[PDB]
Design a protein around this nucleic acid. Structure first.
Ligand code: PHE
Length: 255
RNA sequence: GCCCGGAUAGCUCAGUCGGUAGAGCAGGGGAUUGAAAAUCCCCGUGUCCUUGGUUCGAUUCCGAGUCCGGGCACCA
């Protein structure tokens, strides 16, 4: 899908539109192979990008160029560390490794986006979370140091979400020996890292970042404070499905 | 993955069983001016996206393909 009704609110046209995007992954995959940024999702992002490179007499009176792609490869760490003792950094290593696994599971789409005209970047875990996280976490806690801000409401909502998720997860294996306070606090840590990912990402990348869903968790609270007056955080919503196979160039298995 | 709409003059779209599809823009020709600029008037051979059927005949009715959207399922 798209948001043509949202293109005029910013009112910056007749030029290349710097865009970004960030994918995620859950520990226990309920939909298994089906997930965000599947093959259909990447091909549909490419198609929605190419839809603005056509109709030059109807878009001048929408363009897609210079794009980037982020990955929260270092977000769901403690989510996977519950299965085995392992280590604190080993859980990171493995989760970011699966992130890079997907990054290689659809590299053809990333490279073919460059043939369609759009640039291709590849942000990762450390590539973003490697600078200015002390002041970021400090500001997150400064917003979460009072029950008046809706940051506590979003905290409780995401906490209930991750709590149901971790309850269903540990309901299969009770050998984790984790704590309810531990699950809640690790979920809140991931949530605050996602909230602090508005400051660091909005400052690291120019203009806007688009996700298929809404993704207003933490991003709204932080970006309305800082990014909305430094680098406008505009979230565009995408949405596709499966019905008729589109034309995919070099759509074959590697050999 | 499942389910629901459209494509018509060059372009926008309006056309409701199946009863020779027309309003706006554009564009050509005019009268009048010395000439243009306003105003009036004339001007559409459209397989209604191709290709198989009912009919007396199908725009929209049934079958096959091409291209634009929607509603769900999965939220994280
Ligand atoms: C899921 O765990 C999300 N918090 C991860 C995420 C999604 C989109 C953008 C940034 C982070």
């Amino acid at each position: 899908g798209l948001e043509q009704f949202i293109l005029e609110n910013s009112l910056i046209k007749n030029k290349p539109i710097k865009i970004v995007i960030g994918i995620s992954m859950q520990s226990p995959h309920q939909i298994s192979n089906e997930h965000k940024q599947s093959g259909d999702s990447f091909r549909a992002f490419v198609d929605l990008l190419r839809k603005t490179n056509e109709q030059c007499i109807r878009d001048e009176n929408i363009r897609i160029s210079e794009l980037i792609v982020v990955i929260t490869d270092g977000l769901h760490r403690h989510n996977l560390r519950l299965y085995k003792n392992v280590s604190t950094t080993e859980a990171e290593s493995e989760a970011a490794g699966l992130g890079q696994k997907w990054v290689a599971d659809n590299r053809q789409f990333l490279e073919a986006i460059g043939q369609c005209g759009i640039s291709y970047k590849v942000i990762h875990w450390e590539e973003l979370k490697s600078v200015a996280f002390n002041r970021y976490l400090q500001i997150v806690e400064e917003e979460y140091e009072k029950p008046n801000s809706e940051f506590r409401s979003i905290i409780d909502n995401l906490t209930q979400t991750h709590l149901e998720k971790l309850v269903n997860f540990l309901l299969e294996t009770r050998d984790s020996s984790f704590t309810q306070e531990d699950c809640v606090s690790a979920t809140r840590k991931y949530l605050l890292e996602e909230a602090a990912s508005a400051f660091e990402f909005a400052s690291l990348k120019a203009d806007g970042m688009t996700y298929p869903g809404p993704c207003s968790p933490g991003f709204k609270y932080i970006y309305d404070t800082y990014l909305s007056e430094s680098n406008p955080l505009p979230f565009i919503e995408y949405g596709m499905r499966g019905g008729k196979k589109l034309p995919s160039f070099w759509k074959e298995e590697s050999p």
